[PDB]
Design a binder for this molecule. Structure first.
Ligand code: NAP
Ligand code: NAP
Ligand code: NAP
Ligand code: NAP
Lengths: 336, 336, 336, 336
């Protein structure tokens, strides 16, 4: 088994832990935490070995009755690779340590591309990470945009993408963040960061705008794409039905909003009721001459999870063909 | 096993369906819907036979490509008991039809006690439904209050309960309901109806007040109980730890809010990440004079689920010992 | 003064009544209500004669303690014009009575353009309502897009507009409407109604998309405009500074969201804390080749109010110059 | 006229500045800010002299185009009293400077009673601040509880108060604070701070519990009061109608929530559409034996405002009869 360490057992971290553990060629040998809370105790219940960020906080865990295996420094001595799921900006800080231990690592979307030097999205540029040392899985929204823009680019040739991102204010468990009742340009200076992030893995012309609204469940995307070859609605539907980690939903069938989508995710019975796939509203798919309009949604806590599994296989050279990794990841995770 | 029909496969009904199906002594022989949406299609994927409320709607399902097994009248012919999970007021109307077929039935808390004649809560009055025909499982909030007040009455003797209910405005999937940004007395004439409802199953002196606020996750209760024999905080903690379906949580461990409680439920991994249990904040348990103050929360979509399973064992005379049924329901549901 | 009647003293109608009354050449001779609640009582406190929608409701107001002047039929006999602010679809029903009485009327944006025959926006098509009988002031979002797209068209020649509307779910006082926690495509089939609606007053190529989010304060617009003449950011700023009822704001000065904008509107001290103007985030104004990007917001309860006052001048032939009416309206309303 | 300085032109401070300016015996000689934002610019629009907290930030305001009159030190030399409206804990730090200056001052409810020495509520203990040096106007919720508890105490004699406070998460313009979707015990260790805070101004036995919910508009209170003399619903209604700054509203009249109350406040037309008074739901007034139950709401941004004007008259010995200051304050502020 490749031995994977998870530095940061948080929102992404705990889900990546489980997805890695579900594969047949990897196992989790450690997850880390900085504070002794209910997630630290649930890691133990789930069978993981729990490690502590810095050595002087180990006494905290001891005092709360939480068994500790050691520190992150010890956790990395035993890994083949480490998946960094720490807060934005901490991953780059952890990189000095990773290089000093000579261990390879995968970072999440909140890190800057140029601190890591390489960005990953399984369908768009899996081969750019093959046999590399360090790679950044792009963000939840960036990932969601690539899921449908990549297959569009291959089939019809992207001329220009204009997208407006309606972002969730805070994940379900983050109770200290707003807004309670506001719409916030994010940021007001345009265009937003999503464009340039998409360009780190997919070479297309794209401008984005984003705002923040008082919802916690999912982000929502308003996408407009000018293409080179004239598509039809029927052609776009087949492309989305065929592409991996994308599903078509219907408002007519009752999925009129991100709340009803997450309700559907609860009926699917996967880990945490998560929706790793990007749902596209079928009724929204529209063609105006050589321009495609459509709406989609992103379950921000889990869409990047499968991308982390695929990234391990690229970085550790376990599989050279991205489709094989994608497919094996999906089978072990019960992806739709 | 005993063959159970579920009339009304909605928020409560789809959950009761799965809980019956987990039992070793019961099975679901059908669930019913009135419209062909995604939940109707998920019902077929869980292996349930789908029945349509009225004969003239069978063709709506046929044209949507959803295979139906018959009408509600047909479903009932196959069952030993029907669990009615139809909207408030419809249950009373279905009572007539159940009488005509003769089938025994369980109703939900939205129905009036006067129209059903009996109310039910597993720990406080299981024996009053034993071998009877029809019983009303009390509402989400009423069940939540009984879970902690019954054990308090048994150990210390309740003299008076004063409770203020902070209600969630609408379930997560219900997007057409408010409020978006208000606090609404519910109702403004006091005392509210949770008190009388608790008294249909638990013979105590209780006055309640309630409001609605902009959240969908859980209800939150502020309870103040005057007792006959004043206990210590440790005694109360012992009582709550020993009573079934009540858990103790701590804000010191990170469960500072209903959003973090539901995050905890997602790490538990039961069906739909539900929280069947009533969580009490350990640090809130306080004794002032001869009175106990505490705070708890209720996951309104599922705290009544297990109660419905126990009501089937009482109504059909499968188990005369309320503790043996509660224990068996709990093992099959993976309840804490 | 011209005698103006307000049929429907609701969200828009109470605001239109105060704006009409502030004018030096118009006065309110009555407002109507269907139910005797607190706003019926406040209408009397403001000096307005209060009329009842239907005559068989006069007794209802009288035993509620509310002194009524008569019915809507009596109201129209007192007026030179009626401004209809009834719920969507009722304005077209009232149109029949207006015609039978022989009275000119102005309608709101929720009516269908085809049931009215003429739409109005003060800056883009004032002259088309000059001396006519009936006209529809376009909706809050339609008005907001016209305020900035008209001047852009006049200066650079619009070739194509793409706009994403992020809509508030329900006005502050509307506590029974959601969504509490969701993003809802509105509708899922595109393009949405805003584009065609803009075209009833402004002859341009425009496609819009829209969603509803859990906010009450303001709608927010993401606007992308391809123009004929190459624009510069400083030139657009001058255009927007020069155009009536448009203001430039900055996130650097603390106006980072719709909530801080509305806070700024309470500092202005006009009627009900309203923001009649369309605020454009200064920093969002971007030029890419011949394409302009910018974000704006809309205080949906009141951006249409000043349009109604200019529509009366058009309809009753009080002023043929649209800039004289706009400036006269702005001065009486204390519009920036 | 007494020359008053406002230190901290924020949520409370901007409102206190206007209320002071409205009096015929006081004037505002200055308001202070720390950052040059839209509120600093609006202070100048309103005619106030703007002072900067720290001297090196003077240049910072000047460079932003904001004419400054000097530093806080300068401002305090021009005043007979300073009303501190700085963030919690900051009042205490500033008290040292006020003492060094020999200037009397009023603090807001965020400061600790022990750090200031004395607390104030106009009706409850106005005389305790008569001629003193420093006093603390108690918080929005403490003031709200005292407005109806004091009169009930005087008429019937309070034996015990049990209250559950439903708190708004963040003020309308605060967009960085949550929760978006949760209920948070505040705190989980009971009883809460309101009880002890009421006792700094009113000598009664009271226990409180508080929670935070996703609303911005008003707090809401659920109040249970055991009293010595047997009350009747009608005598309570007369007691609240007769008491200053308390109004009776009804759900039947359309005021069913905090959002509809605030809608009523917008029809009243005072400064910023505030609601300085405490609304009590008339239909919630209930008597059971010798216990009164009732619900009220608080507009947290302004209920403390008139209290601050009365504190100035107490502190500066401008009036010794608390009813004369209350009534004069009410008349100048257009209070019901
Ligand atoms: N939030 C999303 O939906 C999302 C989606 C995709 C990608 N991302 C990105 O993924 C990354 C992680 O985000 P997240 O939401 O999962 O954050 P999170 O929930 O706050 O999790 C961060 C985890 O890192 C741990 N941690 C903090 N400092 C650490 C340190 N110095 N060393 C080791 N562990 C440390 C924390 O432990 P303690 O809790 O005990 O302090 C926590 O378990 C960021 O780059 C973010 O932008 C986030
Ligand atoms: N919601 C809670 O949190 C909660 C908790 C505890 C107890 N309860 C109580 O449980 C009951 C059900 O509430 P709920 O939230 O589950 O309602 P719900 O989600 O609206 O579900 C009602 C279900 O009944 C079906 N239905 C409607 N009319 C029917 C009829 N004539 N015959 C058969 N099925 C019919 C509906 O089918 P279609 O959807 O296809 O139209 C739907 O599946 C009420 O008494 C409620 O007070 C609710
Ligand atoms: N809502 C907005 O923000 C908004 C913004 C811009 C434009 N508009 C458009 O303005 C129009 C009105 O919307 P609104 O939000 O102001 O509606 P609203 O608040 O519901 O007010 C409608 C008013 O009409 C009265 N009414 C109902 N039926 C009536 C009848 N048959 N005859 C006379 N009066 C009657 C109601 O009286 P009672 O209350 O006594 O029943 C109420 O006073 C719609 O076309 C809407 O699309 C709305
Ligand atoms: N928020 C409420 O609803 C409320 C209600 C009742 C009572 N209170 C109590 O009222 C007090 C103030 O709260 P708030 O909501 O008004 O706060 P706020 O909105 O944050 O305003 C505080 C003001 O103080 C200024 N300030 C900050 N540091 C300063 C310093 N060192 N010297 C002088 N001025 C300084 C800030 O200026 P800048 O903006 O330029 O930085 C701001 O103008 C607290 O005790 C609070 O607990 C609050």
């Amino acid at each position: 088994m490749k031995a994977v360490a998870i530095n940061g057992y948080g929102t992404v971290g705990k889900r990546v832990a489980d997805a890695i553990a579900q594969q047949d060629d990897m196992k989790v040998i450690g997850v880390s935490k900085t504070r002794p809370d209910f997630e630290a105790r649930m890691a133990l219940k789930k069978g993981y070995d729990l490690y502590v960020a810095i050595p002087e906080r180990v006494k905290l865990f001891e005092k709360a009755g939480i068994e500790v295996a050691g520190t992150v420094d010890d956790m990395l001595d035993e890994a083949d690779i480490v998946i960094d799921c720490t807060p934005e900006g901490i991953g780059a800080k952890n990189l000095k340590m990773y290089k000093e231990k000579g261990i390879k690592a995968i970072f999440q979307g909140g890190e800057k591309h140029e601190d890591i030097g390489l960005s990953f999205n399984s369908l768009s540029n899996y081969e750019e990470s093959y046999g590399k040392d360090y790679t950044r899985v792009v963000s939840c929204n960036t990932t969601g945009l690539c899921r449908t823009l990549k297959p569009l680019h291959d089939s019809f040739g992207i001329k220009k993408v204009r997208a407006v991102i309606v972002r969730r204010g805070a994940d379900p468990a983050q109770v200290s963040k707003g807004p309670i009742n506001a719409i916030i340009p994010n940021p007001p200076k345009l265009p937003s960061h999503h464009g340039p992030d998409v360009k780190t893995v997919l070479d297309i012309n794209i401008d984005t705008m984003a705002v923040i609204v008082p919802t916690t469940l999912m982000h929502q995307h308003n996408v407009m794409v000018e293409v080179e070859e004239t598509p039809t609605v029927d052609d776009i539907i087949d492309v989305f039905e065929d592409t991996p980690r994308v599903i078509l939903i219907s408002a007519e069938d009752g999925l009129t909003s991100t709340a009803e989508i997450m309700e559907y995710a609860k009926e699917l019975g996967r880990s945490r009721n998560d929706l790793f796939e990007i749902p596209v509203w079928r009724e929204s798919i529209t063609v105006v001459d050589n321009e495609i309009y459509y709406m989609q949604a992103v379950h921000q806590e889990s869409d990047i999870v499968p991308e982390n599994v695929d990234a391990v296989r690229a970085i550790l050279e376990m599989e050279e063909d991205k489709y094989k990794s994608i497919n094996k990841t999906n089978k072990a995770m019960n992806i739709l």
